[PDB]
Every structure is written in C-alpha cells, then in structure tokens.
Design an enzyme around this catalytic site. Structure first.
Site, short mmCIF file in Angstrom:
data_model
loop_
_atom_site.label_atom_id
_atom_site.label_comp_id
_atom_site.label_asym_id
_atom_site.label_seq_id
_atom_site.Cartn_x
_atom_site.Cartn_y
_atom_site.Cartn_z
N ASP A 265 -6.91 4.21 -1.67
CA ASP A 265 -8.12 3.43 -1.44
C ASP A 265 -9.32 4.30 -1.10
O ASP A 265 -10.45 3.82 -1.19
CB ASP A 265 -7.88 2.42 -0.33
N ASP B 72 -6.29 0.74 3.27
CA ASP B 72 -5.53 1.39 4.33
C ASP B 72 -5.06 2.79 3.95
O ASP B 72 -4.89 3.64 4.83
CB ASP B 72 -4.32 0.54 4.73
N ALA C 297 -53.81 -4.82 16.28
CA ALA C 297 -53.39 -6.19 16.56
C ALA C 297 -52.62 -6.80 15.40
O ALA C 297 -51.68 -7.56 15.62
CB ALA C 297 -54.61 -7.05 16.90
N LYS D 61 13.07 8.02 -7.42
CA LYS D 61 12.80 6.67 -6.97
C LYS D 61 11.35 6.34 -7.27
O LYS D 61 10.47 7.20 -7.17
CB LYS D 61 13.10 6.49 -5.48
N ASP E 70 -7.20 -3.91 -0.74
CA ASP E 70 -5.88 -3.36 -1.01
C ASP E 70 -4.81 -4.34 -0.53
O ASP E 70 -5.01 -5.07 0.44
CB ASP E 70 -5.74 -2.00 -0.31
N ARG F 199 0.71 8.97 -8.08
CA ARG F 199 0.40 7.60 -8.46
C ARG F 199 0.10 7.43 -9.94
O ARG F 199 0.00 6.29 -10.41
CB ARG F 199 -0.79 7.09 -7.64
N1 LIG Z 1 6.99 7.23 -1.69
C1 LIG Z 1 7.08 6.47 -2.92
N2 LIG Z 1 8.02 7.00 -3.69
C2 LIG Z 1 8.29 6.47 -4.90
N3 LIG Z 1 7.60 5.39 -5.33
C3 LIG Z 1 6.65 4.84 -4.55
C4 LIG Z 1 6.38 5.37 -3.36
N4 LIG Z 1 5.41 4.65 -2.80
C5 LIG Z 1 5.07 3.68 -3.64
N5 LIG Z 1 5.84 3.80 -4.73
C6 LIG Z 1 5.82 2.96 -5.90
O1 LIG Z 1 4.54 3.35 -6.80
C7 LIG Z 1 4.00 2.24 -7.19
C8 LIG Z 1 2.46 2.41 -7.30
O2 LIG Z 1 2.02 3.41 -6.42
P1 LIG Z 1 1.04 2.98 -5.16
O3 LIG Z 1 0.96 4.10 -4.17
O4 LIG Z 1 -0.34 2.67 -5.66
O5 LIG Z 1 1.68 1.65 -4.42
P2 LIG Z 1 1.13 1.05 -3.00
O6 LIG Z 1 2.25 1.06 -1.99
O7 LIG Z 1 0.00 1.92 -2.49
C9 LIG Z 1 0.50 -0.68 -3.22
P3 LIG Z 1 -1.25 -0.82 -2.61
O8 LIG Z 1 -2.17 -0.06 -3.53
O9 LIG Z 1 -1.64 -2.28 -2.62
O10 LIG Z 1 -1.39 -0.28 -1.21
C10 LIG Z 1 4.35 1.23 -6.09
O11 LIG Z 1 4.49 -0.01 -6.62
C11 LIG Z 1 5.70 1.71 -5.54
O12 LIG Z 1 6.80 0.90 -6.12
CA LIG Z 2 -49.69 -5.42 16.63
CA LIG Z 3 -50.06 -11.04 17.72
MG LIG Z 4 -2.57 -0.17 0.60
#
Ligand SMILES: Nc1ncnc2c1ncn2[C@@H]1O[C@H](COP(=O)(O)OP(=O)(O)CP(=O)(O)O)[C@@H](O)[C@H]1O
Ligand SMILES: [Ca+2]
Ligand SMILES: [Ca+2]
Ligand SMILES: [Mg+2]
Length: 1020
Positions: free
Chosen positions: A704, A700, A305, A512, A351, A489
């Site tokens: 992350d 995303d 109980a 780039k 992010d 990165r």
């Molecule tokens: N495919 C790519 N080629 C060359 N440079 C890139 C790239 N993607 C992102 N970058 C550059 O690298 C830098 C840092 O890398 P990162 O991958 O952490 O950016 P991100 O797009 O993920 C921002 P967050 O972390 O908020 O999602 C970015 O600021 C971007 O200018």
């Molecule tokens: Ca009970």
């Molecule tokens: Ca009870």
């Molecule tokens: Mg992101």
C-alpha cells in the site's frame, strides 16, 4: 564500539560477548542498561515559541497590515517625540489585532502539537530480539534494547537502533533511509566490513540506522548504539522542513487573498481619487499637500479595515482544532492542512487485509488430495478449531478427532507450513496472549503447525512460552533451510530450499503462495506418499473448492502449498533479481491448500454505510483472490448480498485488458479490485485522480505504500507496517475505521467555518466601504476619520471573527455529496448575499449619520438639501440661516455612525454560525466563544465611549439611551435580512429553540416603540 562498520562481525560480536544464536543474557542486559540507559530520545521542543509566533506574520495580509502600521507610525511624526496617546494611537490599534490573532493561532497550534505528541505514546514501539531467557525471537519494547543484543529487522519494520548487520536471511536487503541520508531510493545492504573509518552514512552499507525502515528482505544484526548515540539522535535537532503537497484548499485561499488584496488596493485608490477636489479646503490646513496626507491616511485606514487580516489566523486555528479533535479520537495527523482533505474526498480506496479486516488470521480449513484416478479424484478435507494465535485448537476430518498417523500428506503439509515461514509466535506475559512476530499469514501457518502436531510431540510440561514454537522447532530440527526465495508480489509465491542434516543429494524446495498461481505451475500431485501426474479434472476441482471456501460464509483467505522435488543446486541458481525466482518454482508437486479466516472489523460495515450517505464511494484494492474479495465486500456492505458484480469487480489482468471506454467506466463504476500489485494499486489511484477525484487511500502494508503517497491523503493503521505509516498523512492509532467518517465530518466542518469567516468579513467590510462611498456620493460630511476606521477594524475584524473558527458543525453536514474542487471558492449566490448585507450595512451607517442631522431631537433639524450642500454653509448664503458649520463637524454623527457600524457588525457576526440554519435553530450560545467575543467588543466600545479621557482621542461623544435605541433600531434588521436570505437559500435553492425566541422577542418589542423617519430624501 567506535567504528562498527570497519570491523568483522566476529569482532563486533566478541566486543559485547554475544552469539547471534542465543543472544544477550539477562545479567548482560541489566549491566548494559545500567551503563547505557533507555533506547529513547529526550522529548525536545517541536517549534520554538519565538519561531511559532514569527511564522504567524508570514502571510501577505499580515505583512501589509504591518506595513500600514509602520506607515501610520512614520506619518504621525509631525513632532519629534512630544505625544504618546493622542498621536500614536493608530499604529497601536493596528498592531493590537495582529498580536491578538497571533496569540490565538500560536495557542491553538501549541495545543495541537501537545495533543499529537501525547498521542505519539499511545502504543509503545516494539522490537524483535534474541535473548537467553527464551530460545525464540521475542518482542520487547524498543526502549529496552541495549547495545549488544541480537535484533532481527523483518521487512516492513522500523529499525529500532543502530545495528551492525550480521546475517541476511533473504536474498537481498533493501532499506529506506530517506529520513537520514536524504536519498529517495532503497539502499542495498551487505554484511561485509567497509575499510573507510570516516565513511559517510551513504557508504555504511553494512549498518542499519535507527528510525529507517526496511523496504525489502529479512536480516538480523547486533546493536552497536542506542538512544542519543544513534546517527538519528546526534542530528535530532538539525532537520529540514518539507511541506507535503500544498492542499488544494490552500491554493484557493491564497489566490483569493491575492485577488482580495488587488480589489482592496483598487478601492483605496478610488477613495483617494474621488476626494481630489477638496484638498485645498482650509479644513485640512489650507494646502493641497495637507489634504493629500489626510485622505491618504483615510485610504490606508480603509485598506487596513477592509483587508481580512484574520484569515490566516483563523485558518490555522481551524486546522489545529481539527487536529486536536482527531487526536482525541486516536488519529495522528502529521500536517495540519491535511485535516481538511477528507472533507472533500469523493473516493476512499482501502486495502483489504489488515485495514478492512482485523488481521487476526487463523487457518480454519485445509485439504489434501486423497486419491486421483484419471478423470476422477477424491479429496481429504479437514477443519481446525480456534480463531486466535493460541496453539490449543484441534483438527477434525469429519467432525471427528483425527488419529495420530492416519494421513501421510498432513506431515508434508506441516513441513511446508513450518519451513516456509518467516514469522513466529510470541507469548506476551504482560497480556498473557500469543502474538505474531512477522506476518499474519505465516503466523497463522505456524499456529496451524502447532495445532496439528504431526510428530506427536509431548506438550505436557512445556510452559506457555515453550508451547508457542514447539512443533515448529521439532520440524525444523529435521531439515536444514539452505536459503529462502522471499515472497514477491509479482510472483505471489515464496520458496525455501531445504537439505537433510547429514550430507547423504536429497534437497527439496517448499513453495507456498496464491492458489491459482502455484497450481498453474504444479505438474504433479502428492496423494499420500505417491507422486502422480497432474490432470485437468483435479486442477478444476481444487479451484472449485478454493472458490467455495472464498465465497462461503467464512470468506476464507486461501493459500496453496507445493514441493519441488528435484531442484537445482545453489551454484546453478541465479538469485540476483526476483524476476528469476519464478524460474525455479516450476514443475512443482501440489500438496494441499489452507484456508484461513480473517474477520472484518466491526466498525467497517457501519462506517461504509455512512460514507455512502455522505456521497463517498468506497473501493477495495486488494492483492487477494477475487472471490474472497467480493465476499468481504458483500459482508461489509460494498456490494449487496445478491447484487450482480459482473462490471463492478475486476482483477488486475481484467482491468489492464480493457478499452479506455470500459477502463474509464470501471473507475467510476467498479467498487472492488483484486489481484492487483502495489504498482497497480498506485495505478488505480492515478486513474481515479485522472478523472478529477480527491482520493483517500487507506492501507496497512508495504504494497500500500506506493498508493498511500499517490492519493491526496493516506491513512495508515496503527498496527500496520511502519513503511505504510511513513507513506501516510494520518495514522489510526487504535485501528478504528469509524474514525475516517469523523475525519470527513471534521474536514467538512473546517471548510464550513472558513466559509462563514469569509462571509462575515466580506459582508461587513464591503459595508464599511459602501458607507464611505455613499457619504462621498450624497455629499454628506465624512462619517468616520482614520482612527475610527481602525477602531471598528480592531473591534469587528478581531476576536469576533476568529471565534467563527469554533463554530459547531451543521446537522446535515454528512448528508450531502462532497464538494467539487473545481467549483469556485465563492458562489454567485454567496456574492449576492455579501453585497446585499454590505449594502444594508453601508446604508444603515449613512442613515444613522444623517438621522442625527435631519430627524434628531437633540441635534439640529437641518434639511436634506442643506446637509448635502454643507460646504456652501455660510452666513452670507441666503439659504443658510439658523445653522452654521460648527454643527457639520459635530462628533455626534460620527459617534452615531461608528456605534451603528460596530453594532451592526456584531449582529452580522450572529448571522455567521451557519450558512443556512437560522438563529432559531442554531442559537448564538452554540458558539460561546463568539458570544464572549461580541460581549468583549461591546465592552471595549462602551469603554472608549464613556471613560474620561478616551472620547477626545477617538473624537466621539457619550451617547444617551435614546440614541442607543436608534442604534439598535437600525442595527437589528440585518439579522432578519440575513434570515430572509437563509430562508431563500434553504427552500428555493436547496424544531426551533423556544428558549431563544422568548428571550429576544421581548427585546424586539421593547426596542420598537415609536417611529422616526427622515425628511425629503431626494437623491436617496
Ligand atoms: N508470505 C507469503 N508467502 C506466500 N504467499 C503469500 C504470502 N503473503 C501473501 N501471499 C499470497 O500472495 C497473494 C498476493 O500477495 P499480497 O501481498 O498482495 O496479498 P495481501 O496479504 O497483501 C492482501 P491485501 O493487499 O488486501 O493486504 C495473497 O493472496 C497471498 O495468498
Ligand atoms: Ca481588517
Ligand atoms: Ca470589520
Ligand atoms: Mg493489507
């Protein structure tokens, strides 16, 4: 294809008759879908209905009630099968409540599983294929993939089918196949045949398995098995369950349950001990062992109980209700106990790109260096119209249409943006929109190249599909991309080695990346067609323009573009590890920058405002620049539009080079982190948890994923990386950021319902114990026998207790700071409330048992001294005449006590809809399940009281209306007692419903009509 890993890629391609360049024809796809079917697994049962009900009886409390039921069954064997309703009624009522709670829990978690599996199909999973209907990669449904077509896998994606690898586009391919092989490390893959035909999945290093994710690198291959023929479909019924972390609320509840079990055992031993004296009485059968069995029976019945056996069931029902309420908001919660963590979350890390922003990037501005004369320099800034992936925009120099062949730097900028891309543009005809194939940044660059049209390609007769990658193909037909130093990165850059078509050494590299990182390596400048040495004033003005872009009204996301004009040959480069890649992107030549817009989600700026209202601190953890990060923070509301962010916004390098004093002040004061790598993204969460905080990471992308596993709960976006969805415990299918506030409120409500359940059961069962101990202390006859204790258990601790899991959320649930996890589960004020209500309940039942003896019109008029000394009632005792022992074992006081106990616990169940809100503010009909359960319990009580053969089984008698009036007179004041306690808790510690007052007030005035008090209460 029986053994795909043991065959050359040429043989696997010739078996289906496919070229990796063009792909599978439409007739071939039709035939292979006719022969193989859809690439999908049948929906199989998540948990067996027998497994689902067996997992309900796993807790300690349910098991000890099962043990007590077995004991009561065995202890009822004083005859070998001669009774069925007068002897075995105790185990039946012990098992009935267990069966009811199990049914409720199974039904709730079944509903939760159904909702989750119905939300699993919210978005159809896609796959990138090469088919002869187009000349570019296209996104089809993951179920439309037949064995034979070419599929690129594109790091961040989930492998859609068993794929024999054909060519790796990057320098290396790391795959995460923990779901199949169990290994928790990324496996390196090649495109060479393994000779072992019976090789295990660990040695198939040239194959990709369905359901696994790509950790790094881009590749493509030919599908060899779809549907059930995949390695994950052949073992889809055989799996190993893994519990995630054992949420801190679960440990609290477990230790509380074991402490309560110890307390209940002690109370029951005390009950058996304080009755050692009257074991030799003839009432039990005239033997010591006869009385010991009876009071051992009372002890086990009081254990049953007093134990809160409905606690695990109500926990599971609360978790399943929360999971279903979240699934209604398009939120896929993986584990049930993870719906509560966001209720105690104090910090939400998020992010920036893709999570706080809509991830729909578009290059809005760009510049090339016009002229550089020593100390002075002049740029050439352009602006591009169009905010979607549709390549129909225009380029404006000064809000004037750019001519055909004015600027020569634009040709090189387009060449860099086209050849240094791993993404593409796909025209979805079902929706008639252009979508990204790959990354949003690279797809924005592709759309920019399409908008520029630096070679003046005729786009008159081109379809909506051919216009997606027309200029990109025109540019790519001029150079031969040798290899690709993929984006890392730590370097924040990506390079592509290009060579002319005809062998005439004129190879270049196109780089780039992040603006500051790429510019720090640029030692030259492309002014038109001239390469001039890079100065310091130009390096300052370029960074000034990039900062102006990032901090402007658009808050652009900037990249830098460079060309290495005299690179090394392939045989002189060592591309084993990524750390050496930056050793080749040196002595660059700056060409230009591109700034792209990525708007924040419209549901963020509001939800942030709500989180701060609930005491939650939102931090931004991004790898983007500090200027644009702080600008987005100001736009969404993390920072004020003119707030000083000197010590509230940091970068990775700034946060690393900080004294532990400042490094600990940051995590408690900073609200923005830029230029942080995935390792630093996880290190931030590690620090925040080191400061004893419940952290929720939302992300995303792949960067992350290490942090999503470190936080107490990871939230992934539906349109995000599959790695981020695997590393998380909640997926926002519709990418609604305001769903996180709903999940916080849901977790808080779950905790509130748990607390109200605890309050109701503890404050009622401590009264059930106080009644027994007070009848034993005063010397009164025993008010309840074991079967009546088990009846009040089945009536009160059953459905009226589980119906508290359906309580509505309080209105001030999101206006309070989060709960401190170091605080105890039960406060001291809460213990005081429990003991107060329980003392009143016990005193009320003992008084109702003693009201019939002393001050009842139907019953006798015995005095207090004669009642407390009923064992000395003899016809020879001079102070005992007119009464006899036959009235001291009357079933009328036992019935009065039992009915008062049931009614007072049904009334206390109404005091448990809210911790502090009165009944006038939250009426009982706010929880209709609780009203129904109370009605059912009262119906069952009235049933056993008046149906013909029932009262002789429970040893009770039918009560008239004048005694039910006393039952309600004694039972109702518990409501106003808890009302007083709630009033004290609302004002001195921290719009009433008029339809409710005008409904219960006439009842209150009608019940109280007279007054009947006891006589000469000496002891109490
Ligand atoms: N495919 C790519 N080629 C060359 N440079 C890139 C790239 N993607 C992102 N970058 C550059 O690298 C830098 C840092 O890398 P990162 O991958 O952490 O950016 P991100 O797009 O993920 C921002 P967050 O972390 O908020 O999602 C970015 O600021 C971007 O200018
Ligand atoms: Ca009970
Ligand atoms: Ca009870
Ligand atoms: Mg992101």
């Amino acid at each position: 294809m029986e053994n795909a890993h043991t065959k050359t890629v040429e043989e696997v391609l010739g078996h289906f008759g496919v070229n990796e360049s063009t792909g599978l024809s439409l007739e071939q796809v039709k035939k292979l879908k006719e022969r193989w079917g859809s690439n999908e697994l049948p929906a199989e049962e998540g948990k067996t209905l027998l497994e689902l009900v067996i997992e309900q009886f796993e807790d300690l409390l349910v098991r000890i009630l099962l043990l007590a039921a077995c004991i009561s069954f065995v202890l009822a064997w004083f005859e070998e099968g001669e009774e069925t309703i007068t002897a075995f009624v105790e185990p039946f009522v012990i098992l009935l409540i267990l069966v009811a709670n199990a049914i409720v829990g199974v039904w709730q978690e079944r509903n939760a599983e159904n909702a989750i599996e119905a939300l699993k199909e919210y978005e159809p999973e896609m796959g990138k294929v090469y088919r002869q209907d187009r000349k570019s990669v296209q996104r089809i449904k993951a179920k439309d993939i037949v064995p034979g077509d070419i599929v690129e896998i594109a790091v961040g994606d989930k492998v859609p089918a068993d794929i024999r690898l054909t060519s790796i586009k990057s320098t290396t391919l790391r795959v995460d196949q923990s779901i199949l092989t169990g290994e928790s490390v990324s496996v390196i893959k090649h495109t060479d045949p393994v000779p072992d035909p019976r090789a295990v999945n660990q040695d198939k290093k040239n194959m990709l398995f369905s359901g696994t994710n790509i950790a790094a690198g881009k590749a493509m291959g030919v599908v060899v098995a779809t549907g059930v023929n995949t390695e994950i479909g052949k073992i889809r019924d055989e799996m190993v369950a893994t519990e995630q972390e054992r949420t801190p609320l679960q440990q609290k509840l477990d230790e509380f349950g074991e402490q309560l079990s110890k307390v209940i055992s002690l109370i029951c031993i005390a009950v058996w001990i304080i009755n050692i004296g009257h074991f030799n009485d003839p009432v039990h059968g005239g033997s010591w062992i006869r009385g010991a069995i009876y009071y051992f029976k009372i002890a086990v019945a009081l254990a049953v109980a007093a134990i809160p056996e409905g606690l695990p069931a109500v926990i599971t029902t609360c978790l399943a209700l929360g999971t279903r309420r979240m699934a209604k908001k398009n939120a896929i919660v993986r584990s049930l106990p993870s719906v509560e963590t966001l209720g105690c979350t104090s910090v939400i890390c998020s992010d920036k790109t893709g999570t706080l922003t809509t991830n729909q990037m578009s290059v809005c501005r760009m510049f090339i260096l016009d002229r550089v004369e020593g100390d002075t320099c002049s740029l050439n800034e352009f602006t591009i119209t169009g905010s979607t992936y549709a390549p129909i925009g225009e380029v404006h120099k000064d809000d004037k249409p750019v001519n055909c062949h004015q600027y020569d730097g634009l040709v090189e900028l387009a060449t860099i943006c086209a050849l240094c891309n791993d993404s593409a543009l796909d025209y979805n005809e079902a929706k008639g929109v252009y979508e990204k194939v790959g990354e949003a940044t690279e797809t924005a660059l592709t759309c920019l190249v399409e908008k520029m049209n630096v070679f003046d390609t005729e786009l008159k007769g081109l379809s909506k599909i051919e216009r997606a990658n027309a200029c990109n193909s025109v540019i790519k037909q001029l150079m031969k991309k040798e290899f690709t130093l993929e984006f890392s990165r730590d370097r924040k850059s990506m390079s592509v080695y290009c060579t002319p078509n005809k062998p005439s050494s004129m190879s270049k590299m196109f780089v780039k990346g992040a603006p500051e990182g790429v510019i720090d390596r640029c030692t030259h400048i492309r002014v038109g067609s001239t390469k001039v040495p890079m100065t310091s004033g130009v390096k300052q003005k370029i960074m000034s323009v990039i900062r102006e872009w990032g901090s402007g009204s658009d808050t652009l996301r900037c990249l830098a573009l460079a060309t290495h004009d005299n690179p090394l040959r392939r045989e002189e480069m060592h591309l084993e590890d990524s750390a050496n890649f930056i050793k080749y992107e040196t002595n660059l030549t700056f060409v230009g920058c591109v700034g792209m817009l990525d708007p924040p989600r419209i549901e963020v700026a509001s939800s942030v405002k709500l989180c701060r209202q609930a005491g939650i601190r939102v931090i931004m953890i991004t790898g983007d620049n500090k200027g644009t990060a702080v600008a987005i923070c100001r736009r969404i509301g993390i920072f004020g539009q003119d707030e000083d962010v000197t010590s509230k916004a940091f970068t990775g390098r700034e946060f690393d080079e900080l004294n532990p004093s400042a490094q600990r002040d940051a995590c408690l004061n900073a609200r923005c982190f830029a230029r942080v790598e995935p390792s630093h993204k996880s290190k931030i969460v590690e620090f925040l948890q080191s400061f004893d905080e419940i952290t929720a990471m939302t992300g995303d992308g792949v960067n992350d994923a290490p942090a999503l596993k470190k936080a107490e709960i990871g939230i992934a976006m539906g349109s995000g990386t599959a790695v981020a969805k695997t590393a998380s415990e909640m997926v926002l299918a519709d990418d609604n950021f305001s769903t996180i506030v709903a999940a916080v409120e849901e977790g808080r409500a779950i905790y509130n319902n748990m607390k109200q359940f605890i309050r109701y059961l503890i404050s009622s069962n401590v009264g059930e114990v106080v009644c027994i101990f007070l009848t034993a202390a005063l010397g009164f006859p025993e008010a309840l026998i074991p079967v009546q204790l088990l009846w009040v258990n089945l009536v009160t601790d059953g459905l009226p207790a589980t119906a508290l899991g359906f309580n509505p959320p309080d209105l001030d649930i999101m206006n309070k700071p989060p709960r401190n996890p170091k605080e105890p589960l039960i406060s001291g004020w809460l213990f005081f409330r429990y003991l107060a209500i329980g003392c009143y309940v016990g005193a009320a039942t003992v008084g109702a048992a003693a009201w019939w003896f002393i001050a009842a019109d139907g019953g006798p008029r015995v005095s207090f001294y004669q009642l407390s000394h009923f064992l000395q009632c003899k016809e020879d005792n001079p102070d005992f005449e007119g009464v006899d022992c036959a009235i001291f074992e009357s079933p009328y006081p036992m019935t009065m006590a039992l009915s008062v106990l049931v009614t007072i616990e049904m009334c206390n169940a109404l005091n448990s809809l809210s911790e502090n809100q009165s009944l006038l503010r939250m009426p009982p009909w706010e929880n209709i399940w609780l009203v129904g359960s109370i009605c059912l319990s009262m119906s069952l009580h009235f049933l056993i009281l008046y149906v013909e053969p029932l009262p002789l089984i429970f040893q009770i008698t039918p009560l008239n209306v004048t005694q039910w009036l006393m039952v309600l007179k004694i039972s109702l004041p518990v409501i106003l007692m808890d009302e007083t306690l709630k009033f004290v808790a609302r004002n001195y510690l921290e719009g009433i419903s008029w339809p409710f007052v005008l409904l219960i007030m006439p009842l209150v005035i009608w019940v109280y009509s007279t007054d009947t008090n006891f006589s000469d209460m000496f002891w109490s």
